[PDB]
Amino acid sequence: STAGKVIKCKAAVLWEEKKPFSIEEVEVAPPKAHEVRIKMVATGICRSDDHVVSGTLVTPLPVIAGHEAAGIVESIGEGVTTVRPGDKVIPLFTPQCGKCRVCKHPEGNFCLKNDLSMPRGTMQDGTSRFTCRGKPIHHFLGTSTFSQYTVVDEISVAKIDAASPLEKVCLIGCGFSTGYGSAVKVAKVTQGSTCAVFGLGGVGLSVIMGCKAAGAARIVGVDINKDKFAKAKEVGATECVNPQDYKKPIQEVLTEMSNGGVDFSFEVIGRLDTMVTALSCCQEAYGVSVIVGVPPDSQNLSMNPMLLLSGRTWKGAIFGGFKSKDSVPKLVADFMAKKFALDPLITHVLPFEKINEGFDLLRSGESIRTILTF
Amino acid sequence: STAGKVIKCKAAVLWEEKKPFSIEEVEVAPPKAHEVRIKMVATGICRSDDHVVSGTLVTPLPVIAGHEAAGIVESIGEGVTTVRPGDKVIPLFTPQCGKCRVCKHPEGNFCLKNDLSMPRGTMQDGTSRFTCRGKPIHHFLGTSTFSQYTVVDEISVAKIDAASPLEKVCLIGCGFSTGYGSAVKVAKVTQGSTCAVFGLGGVGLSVIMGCKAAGAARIVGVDINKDKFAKAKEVGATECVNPQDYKKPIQEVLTEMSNGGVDFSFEVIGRLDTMVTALSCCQEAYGVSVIVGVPPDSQNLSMNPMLLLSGRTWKGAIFGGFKSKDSVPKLVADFMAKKFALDPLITHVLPFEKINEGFDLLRSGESIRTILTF
Ligand SMILES: NC(=O)c1c[n+]([C@@H]2O[C@H](COP(=O)([O-])OP(=O)([O-])OC[C@H]3O[C@@H](n4cnc5c(N)[nH+]cnc54)[C@H](O)[C@@H]3O)[C@@H](O)[C@H]2O)ccc1-n1cccn1
Ligand SMILES: NC(=O)c1c[n+]([C@@H]2O[C@H](COP(=O)([O-])OP(=O)([O-])OC[C@H]3O[C@@H](n4cnc5c(N)[nH+]cnc54)[C@H](O)[C@@H]3O)[C@@H](O)[C@H]2O)ccc1-n1cccn1
Ligand SMILES: [Zn+2]
Ligand SMILES: [Zn+2]
Ligand SMILES: [Zn+2]
Ligand SMILES: [Zn+2]
């Protein structure tokens, strides 16, 4: 009996940059054709959400952010075939339309229907399902998970195992899959290799997990916050370095440590300077560097192309290279079979209503992932 | 007999930047342990040699340049086991020491003994075999082929088929292998793909040869000199575009031509701006761009890392990614077995004494490869 009707619920609206979220009532329209309305159960706080607040990641405001989440289908629009009411789902911030050249390519995952490259903050049909104070509110990457209910396009949701613990598997919606995929699928880390991981947050820890899973012999965590080192070691870093401890630039320090440069490096921070540092620290003839961090809006890095000419490979990826709708349910199934751990990422749990405290935790450096429960 | 004696012979000496080569008598010392003295038969004029004249590529002066060549072993130093007097040989401007981490890596070819990264202009032992008017003259890339005789370290020479035509196979010493391997080995061009090739000189044409050999369905040549188009089509380009003919940036043109970006792009010129254009023109989620051209000394490019974050791969390579001493003899054998052609790269054959005229042809846009014959 909410099917076909507007739902009034609480969401965290961001009206302005650099301000707290406003927990307040919104109206959520029912799903149109090929849309899905989801009752949220749990959502994680990803740095990319914070980037919306800071202006690092530009997307139209006002907005309902959130993109790392899981919930339960409340209703489906006309013509939906891939989920039903009552299904456990994870919203897919990178869609999988299944029809575009990228979806059809064996390697590609950054589906042409994404709202990340040139964000509009809408549904696929260019409109919004959200009203607050009588004003339309933008969506974020097609997911908008900081709301008790959201509406997503069908291509931006995956059905997952009905017995899944949603307060854990929400991390498969972003941080875990992004970092793990970046190591295992994008870099294709090899047995016995030396890896350097720049940034030891939720995503960088997942990178580490991926490097360890792939059989790396050495995994060097790099962070200016030495509080991050203990957990990085727990999940597989063999050693951790703080650039602030050294007189020399850290690329030189890592090249020394690795007797001439690492096999694989990862930038999991979002700074221009560290993207160049991470490239430079990989071995000049055969090293691979993967950019994971989201850079500040519209800013260009500067680098010497001789870093590449010698033989380095530089690449980046969204969501760990995973084709999202195919991969997310498999990732869940693998989690249920204990093929990887999510608890090491979860440092704090809060009710949704304490979302701003969650953000304070991230900004302070204290948390890895805070999971909010609805 | 000349073995064990100083040879006085003719060479093309570059006394300073931006000046013609001086053709005159030099003295060539006999080879020391693990060194090989070669009588040159044919040497090609590569743009990288002109980059030494122009200061684009910094290496100590005065110098005997030249790196794309073939000749016949005159004598060997103590300890040499891989060639003997009378052998046809190609000097290897990228060595293969076989002991360094790079030589031992299955993909790597930029051996740590190279003189390209931090040019010293000497033999491996840090001395020179050349004197002219009483003055020591530097080596170039461990090769120095603009001389009737040179001396090279054993790791910088490969024995080739005794029946080889040296006036053709000299191109396996640089231009052909560099382009062909950039397509087949570094990019790993796939069947039915779309490729864009920036720069249609000897190296860009060889890239086209490789993209054709790998089964690309479309090969778009890009050059500002439309005189280069006819030969590019002969060797496999399906269409050629001149950026000066368009009101829009060529990346935009190529993206529209390829219905959302190319599978593989190659920068084969050596300009910072075209390196970025080439990257940008490959499909954002799965495209691969390879830098082949040698950029001007010490200059940085600027780019937006979102070009990589979406999924692009950017890489570069020296000498087509070929491990030099293993590959060069196989390449010559494949040529002898008609697996690829070299004649489409040769536009001019001059005596060595007309070296300057050969360089004027390159600079004027009139030639592809000029081969100088001793
Ligand atoms: N590519 C994706 O799909 C993607 C990208 N992001 C981006 O990854 C970065 C990391 O996110 P996080 O792990 O959630 O972030 P933090 O917890 O803040 O960890 C960062 C880590 O870096 C350290 N650090 C800061 N500054 C430095 C310097 N200078 N040196 C060394 N270390 C440093 C901090 O101390 C901290 O521990 C973010 O950029 C993020 O935006 C995340 C996930 C996905 N994505 C894309 C769209 C939505 N989500
Ligand atoms: N990576 C290596 O091992 C390598 C590198 N190089 C470098 O490749 C570039 C091409 O060399 P080339 O084919 O010998 O050069 P040209 O015959 O001059 O061809 C260039 C081609 O480019 C066109 N052009 C100029 N400007 C433009 C613009 N703006 N748009 C499009 N086209 C443009 C010209 O008209 C001309 O047709 C060089 O940088 C070279 O250094 C070669 C070989 C090997 N190497 C490494 C060490 C030694 N040799
Ligand atoms: Zn798609
Ligand atoms: Zn995220
Ligand atoms: Zn070596
Ligand atoms: Zn060359």
Side-chain angles (χ1 to χ4, degrees):
Chain A
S1 84
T2 56
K5 302 166 177 142
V6 173
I7 289 175
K8 288 176 195 204
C9 72
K10 296 303 184 304
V13 177
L14 183 73
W15 290 104
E16 207 184 317
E17 276 180 38
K18 295 174 180 154
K19 294 306 186 177
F21 293 92
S22 180
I23 291 271
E24 66 176 287
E25 175 172 275
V26 301
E27 306 177 280
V28 188
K32 303 203 184 201
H34 293 107
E35 303 174 3
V36 176
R37 187 156 65 178
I38 305 170
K39 180 175 176 170
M40 292 325 302
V41 171
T43 187
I45 295 160
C46 171
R47 177 67 71 166
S48 298
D49 304 296
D50 187 62
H51 287 340
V52 169
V53 182
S54 63
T56 293
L57 184 61
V58 168
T59 195
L61 272 32
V63 62
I64 293 178
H67 65 285
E68 184 178 79
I72 293 167
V73 173
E74 169 277 343
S75 62
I76 56 176
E78 308 199 307
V80 169
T81 58
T82 59
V83 304
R84 287 195 296 272
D87 284 347
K88 284 180 174 180
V89 288
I90 288 175
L92 307 178
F93 79 81
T94 302
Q96 186 175 353
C97 77
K99 293 168 177 190
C100 75
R101 219 171 48 177
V102 178
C103 281
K104 289 217 192 307
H105 189 273
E107 295 303 293
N109 81 315
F110 191 52
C111 170
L112 292 162
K113 303 292 205 191
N114 76 83
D115 196 41
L116 179 68
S117 289
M118 291 223 320
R120 318 177 270 183
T122 65
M123 300 291 289
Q124 288 297 329
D125 77 2
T127 67
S128 162
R129 296 282 163 287
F130 294 122
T131 312
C132 186
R133 311 187 187 184
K135 288 160 173 180
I137 307 300
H138 296 277
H139 295 241
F140 177 52
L141 303 175
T143 56
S144 286
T145 71
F146 293 165
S147 178
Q148 293 172 329
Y149 291 82
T150 188
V151 178
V152 302
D153 291 287
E154 181 171 26
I155 60 167
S156 289
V157 68
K159 183 171 169 187
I160 63 164
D161 189 317
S164 305
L166 296 185
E167 85 283 7
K168 314 293 195 179
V169 296
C170 52
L171 291 176
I172 289 161
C174 186
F176 169 76
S177 304
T178 296
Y180 193 82
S182 299
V184 309
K185 181 167 206 301
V186 181
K188 295 164 197 78
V189 166
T190 52
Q191 184 148 39
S193 69
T194 296
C195 292
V197 183
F198 287 74
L200 305 177
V203 185
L205 293 170
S206 303
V207 173
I208 291 167
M209 289 173 179
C211 292
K212 174 168 183 187
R218 298 177 68 187
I219 306 167
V220 184
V222 188
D223 206 301
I224 52 168
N225 182 358
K226 76 172 184 291
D227 294 350
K228 299 291 172 179
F229 294 170
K231 176 70 57 67
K233 288 177 169 176
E234 292 165 46
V235 302
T238 52
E239 59 228 284
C240 281
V241 288
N242 183 344
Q244 300 173 333
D245 293 343
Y246 294 84
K247 302 188 199 167
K248 279 159 167 178
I250 200 68
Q251 57 198 40
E252 185 181 359
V253 170
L254 293 164
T255 298
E256 291 166 356
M257 286 173 74
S258 58
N259 297 287
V262 302
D263 296 287
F264 306 89
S265 67
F266 303 82
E267 201 280 9
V268 208
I269 301 156
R271 298 177 51 93
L272 303 176
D273 58 4
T274 49
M275 288 168 187
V276 174
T277 290
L279 177 67
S280 306
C281 83
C282 72
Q283 201 288 325
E284 63 176 4
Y286 60 75
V288 175
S289 186
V290 182
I291 301 176
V292 186
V294 168
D297 183 64
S298 308
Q299 302 194 23
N300 280 14
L301 63 72
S302 171
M303 62 80 73
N304 181 329
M306 283 300 312
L307 294 174
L308 296 179
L309 199 71
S310 53
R312 294 184 179 79
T313 301
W314 207 8
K315 64 205 282 192
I318 299 301
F319 196 57
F322 281 114
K323 289 173 183 288
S324 60
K325 194 157 176 155
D326 292 337
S327 307
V328 161
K330 172 61 161 140
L331 288 163
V332 171
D334 288 348
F335 173 68
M336 294 304 293
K338 314 246 341 226
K339 307 301 192 191
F340 58 86
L342 290 172
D343 291 343
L345 303 179
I346 300 172
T347 51
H348 297 81
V349 292
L350 293 167
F352 176 60
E353 291 77 27
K354 298 184 172 130
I355 184 161
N356 290 310
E357 167 172 21
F359 280 81
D360 297 335
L361 290 166
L362 174 75
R363 297 171 184 137
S364 74
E366 192 190 322
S367 55
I368 297 288
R369 284 298 203 259
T370 297
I371 307 301
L372 308 174
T373 288
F374 290 88
Chain B
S1 56
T2 45
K5 302 174 203 166
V6 180
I7 289 180
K8 292 189 172 145
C9 77
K10 200 181 291 184
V13 177
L14 190 67
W15 291 102
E16 65 183 282
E17 68 169 9
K18 309 193 174 173
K19 293 284 168 126
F21 296 91
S22 181
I23 296 122
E24 56 188 295
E25 175 166 81
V26 304
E27 308 90 50
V28 192
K32 304 199 203 147
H34 299 103
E35 290 181 6
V36 176
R37 186 156 66 176
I38 310 173
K39 187 164 190 200
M40 300 319 307
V41 168
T43 186
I45 292 164
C46 166
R47 178 60 76 167
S48 297
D49 303 299
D50 184 64
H51 289 339
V52 173
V53 181
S54 69
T56 292
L57 214 207
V58 171
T59 192
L61 310 180
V63 64
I64 295 180
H67 62 287
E68 179 181 85
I72 293 163
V73 182
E74 172 272 343
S75 69
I76 58 172
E78 190 192 49
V80 170
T81 56
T82 59
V83 302
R84 305 196 183 81
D87 287 345
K88 283 170 170 182
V89 293
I90 281 176
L92 308 173
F93 82 77
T94 302
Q96 182 171 1
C97 78
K99 298 170 309 93
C100 72
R101 228 175 29 179
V102 178
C103 289
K104 290 170 158 163
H105 191 279
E107 299 309 310
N109 78 316
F110 190 50
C111 173
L112 290 167
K113 296 292 199 187
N114 79 86
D115 197 39
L116 181 66
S117 273
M118 304 251 286
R120 297 189 288 177
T122 60
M123 299 297 291
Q124 285 299 318
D125 75 355
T127 69
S128 159
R129 300 280 168 282
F130 292 127
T131 299
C132 188
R133 305 185 197 173
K135 295 166 195 169
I137 306 304
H138 289 92
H139 294 247
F140 175 55
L141 303 182
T143 58
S144 288
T145 67
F146 294 167
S147 181
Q148 293 176 329
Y149 292 79
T150 192
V151 182
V152 305
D153 288 289
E154 188 176 16
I155 58 162
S156 285
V157 67
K159 178 175 170 183
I160 66 168
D161 185 335
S164 301
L166 294 188
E167 81 278 359
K168 301 182 186 306
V169 298
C170 56
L171 294 186
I172 289 163
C174 186
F176 167 81
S177 308
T178 294
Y180 192 82
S182 297
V184 302
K185 180 182 215 78
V186 175
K188 297 170 194 77
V189 173
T190 57
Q191 181 142 37
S193 68
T194 293
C195 293
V197 181
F198 291 74
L200 306 174
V203 182
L205 294 169
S206 298
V207 171
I208 289 171
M209 291 180 179
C211 289
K212 179 159 203 257
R218 295 178 70 190
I219 303 161
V220 186
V222 187
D223 203 303
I224 58 169
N225 181 352
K226 76 167 159 39
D227 298 343
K228 298 292 174 174
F229 296 171
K231 180 60 66 58
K233 302 182 147 181
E234 282 180 29
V235 304
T238 53
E239 53 231 290
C240 285
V241 296
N242 179 343
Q244 305 176 327
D245 290 340
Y246 292 89
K247 300 193 197 180
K248 288 179 168 182
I250 199 68
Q251 62 193 49
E252 293 179 14
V253 171
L254 290 166
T255 301
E256 164 80 338
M257 289 171 65
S258 59
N259 298 295
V262 303
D263 300 288
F264 305 92
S265 63
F266 301 81
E267 200 283 0
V268 206
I269 304 158
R271 293 174 56 91
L272 298 178
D273 49 334
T274 44
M275 289 168 195
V276 176
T277 292
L279 175 69
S280 298
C281 89
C282 76
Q283 202 283 330
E284 66 179 355
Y286 61 74
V288 171
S289 190
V290 181
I291 302 177
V292 187
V294 169
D297 182 66
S298 287
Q299 303 186 20
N300 278 12
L301 59 82
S302 164
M303 63 81 75
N304 191 323
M306 286 299 313
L307 290 173
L308 300 173
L309 201 69
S310 48
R312 296 184 180 81
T313 301
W314 203 9
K315 65 204 288 192
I318 300 300
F319 192 63
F322 283 128
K323 293 183 177 284
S324 59
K325 195 155 176 163
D326 295 334
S327 304
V328 160
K330 175 65 171 158
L331 290 162
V332 169
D334 288 353
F335 176 66
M336 297 307 284
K338 311 288 197 252
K339 301 208 174 140
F340 54 84
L342 293 173
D343 285 351
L345 302 178
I346 301 169
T347 57
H348 294 77
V349 183
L350 305 175
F352 173 62
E353 292 73 21
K354 294 187 186 298
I355 184 162
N356 289 313
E357 293 90 337
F359 277 80
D360 297 333
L361 290 165
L362 184 64
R363 290 163 190 152
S364 74
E366 165 169 10
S367 55
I368 297 294
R369 283 301 204 255
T370 293
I371 308 306
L372 302 175
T373 53
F374 288 90

